[PDB]
UniProtKB/Swiss-Prot annotation, chains A, B:
Residues 92-309 form the Histidine kinase domain. Homodimer. Homotetramer. Dimerizes through interaction of two opposing nucleotide-binding domains. Interacts with E2 component of the branched-chain alpha-ketoacid dehydrogenase (BCKDH) complex. Competes with BCKDK for binding to the E2 component; this interaction is modulated by branched-chain alpha-keto acids. At steady state, BCKDH holoenzyme contains BCKDK and BCKDHA is phosphorylated. In response to high levels of branched-chain alpha-keto acids, the inhibitory BCKDK is replaced by activating PPM1K leading to BCKDHA dephosphorylation and BCAA degradation. This is Branched-chain alpha-ketoacid dehydrogenase kinase. GO terms for cellular component: mitochondrial matrix; mitochondrion; oxoglutarate dehydrogenase complex. It is found in: Mitochondrion matrix; Mitochondrion. The ATP-ase activity is up-regulated by potassium and rubidium ions but not by sodium ions. Up-regulated in the presence of apo- or lipoylated-DBT/E2b subunit of the BCKDH complex. Keywords: Acetylation, ATP-binding, Kinase, Mitochondrion, Nucleotide-binding, Phosphoprotein, Transferase, Transit peptide. The gene is Bckdk. Mg(2+) binds at N212.
């Protein structure tokens, strides 16, 4: 029953399966209201942006979802609950490319307005609400599964080192595929820590930060691709939060780019969403994402995520 | 002729010694106005604080200095200039303990007022103005000296690694004297950098940050004083600024203390002035001082100082 902001992840264990029903009914009351807020967000977008065909498509997707959700009959039994899950699974899949569609839709249209704070706010609000909604929805679905060491999407004994290693292997492959090599990653600090935690946000954030650090490292070592400085990751685990520091020797973020890197769409090269999205996600969950640039040397990125209150 | 804020450090080279006169005359016009501002600062202190006998003593010192400075006759020749230097040297020495007197005077008296922003502002403004004044004054005196690789107090080829090493040896001695041992310090990054720079601010700041990192390291390793994690210092030198990162494995700054550590007087133990003073000095010179705490692991402190414009 651990909560994200104004949102609650049910921990329940009833052999009869009545927690599924209480969970299902909660989801059913909650999803339409939150989808309505997203729709209100689209309605208030500057006209010229809202008229972009890709933005209109996403706008329609949300209306469609609101329609199907409200059309679904109140849940009275396992049979209803079971069918609601099919709808939720369908919606989750239908909406899996939303971040990318928004990025495309907004890329050009955003420069047609005078106030630039506007799109930042819309995206921060839309993407984090969406993260919140997908977490709740996926958590409900997960309550059906019998994975050990999970209560829904909540890992009961998450190892930060393990999940970091997972995304390191992933980022290294992408990097090897593009450059013929990848920095090695060293992990230090509280490497043996284990605690209850929701992987989902880490699954978004970590690969974004690792891809950044690896790209920077390779692009600054073009003469010695076979011998590049390691990326060093430090884990700090205390009673308040989990801190993951990702340090590279990739030459740093230039002074002229520093005020831009947190802007959606800004890139010196994906589509420039990695940093602002990651920060918005971390702040939404009560944490933060901070950068320290050592121009000429490299960058330290500090991810902080609050622990699950007990 | 490199400048600090609203203040100018004369680079001059006249064999006849006329730059000494132009410098002297500049100092003579500039010191009284700036001392007057400091006096105005004392006049506007909350009554109950201004009545503290130590605060009153410092207040009087500044009046006395204004008196002697204004009483000094306009400078028309080397003889006048030469005598002005004696006065400046006397004043510099008379005022050498001002930071410490202010700290004592304010320690108790400050809690007697409702607005806490007040003392922070007074101290930030008083201490940085004082740094500015001492730099100009000392720079003038230094123009008389014939040290090679100096133009006044400006080192023409400052090595960050060398000046860091100087203060490392110093901090290690203090630390060894108190704990029987001291962390080793490793220095990496742009270790061979050399550039024109004014040592004075580094001479204040570095020992403060080194003492902090060493204390934290020892106090968190009481069982293994003979084997403690190194302090690691990274130098980054680029065209805009010099960055010095000081990282320790001293266990970090606790969440409950984090909002306090930049307050004058706050200490978990000198007199709690190291951090706020160092930050005020760095910002005054166009740089910054930022902390990243990894609670349970350690702390990274980032000092940034702008280069001398050319
Ligand atoms: N670790 C890093 N080192 C150097 N530059 C970085 C680092 N992380 C981000 N940046 C800079 O910030 C920009 C924004 O990154 P991001 O938001 O992830 O979008 P993208 O990776 O698509 O460019 C990058 O294009 C890059 O110039
Ligand atoms: N590197 C560090 N590691 C852990 N704690 C630190 C560090 N630097 C500063 N602190 C904390 O911040 C407080 C304020 O430090 P400072 O302003 O230098 O005053 P003082 O050193 O006199 O306490 C210290 O008492 C200490 O608790
Ligand atoms: C209707 C929901 C499940 C869709 C979420 Cl808000 C998303 O865009 O992925
Ligand atoms: C009169 C000057 C030289 C004194 C400076 Cl402002 C200081 O307090 O040290
Ligand atoms: K970006
Ligand atoms: K302090
Ligand atoms: Mg990226
Ligand atoms: Mg100190």
């Amino acid at each position: 029953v651990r909560l994200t902001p104004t949102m609650m992840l049910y921990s329940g264990r009833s052999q009869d399966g009545s927690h599924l029903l209480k969970s299902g009914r909660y989801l059913q009351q909650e999803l339409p209201v939150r989808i309505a807020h997203r729709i209100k967000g689209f309605r208030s977008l500057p006209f010229i942006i809202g008229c972009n065909p890709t933005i209109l498509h996403v706008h329609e997707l949300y209306i469609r979802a609101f329609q199907k959700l409200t059309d679904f009959p109140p849940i009275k039994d396992q049979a209803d609950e079971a069918q609601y899950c099919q709808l939720v699974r369908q919606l989750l899949d239908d909406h899996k490319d939303v971040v990318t569609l928004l990025a495309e839709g907004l890329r050009e249209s955003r420069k047609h307005i005078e106030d630039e704070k506007l799109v930042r706010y819309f995206l921060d609000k839309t993407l984090t609400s969406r993260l919140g909604i997908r977490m709740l929805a996926t958590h409900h679905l997960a309550l059906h599964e019998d994975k050990p060491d999970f209560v829904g999407i909540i890992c009961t004994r998450l190892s930060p080192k393990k999940i970091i290693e997972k995304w390191v292997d992933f980022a290294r492959r992408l990097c090897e595929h593009k450059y013929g090599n990848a920095p090695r990653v060293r992990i230090n600090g509280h490497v043996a820590a284990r605690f209850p935690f929701i992987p989902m946000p880490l699954d978004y954030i970590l690969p974004e930060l690792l891809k950044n650090a690896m790209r920077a490292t390779m692009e600054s070592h073009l003469d010695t691709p076979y011998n590049v400085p390691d990326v060093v990751i430090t884990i700090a685990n205390n009673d308040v939060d989990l801190i993951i520091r990702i340090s590279d020797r990739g030459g740093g973020i230039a002074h002229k780019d520093l005020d831009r890197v947190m802007d959606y769409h800004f890139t010196t090269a994906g589509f420039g969403f990695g940093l602002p999205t990651s920060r918005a996600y971390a702040e939404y969950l009560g944490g933060s994402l901070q950068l320290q640039s050592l121009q000429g040397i490299g960058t330290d990125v500090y991810l902080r995520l609050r622990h699950i209150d007990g």
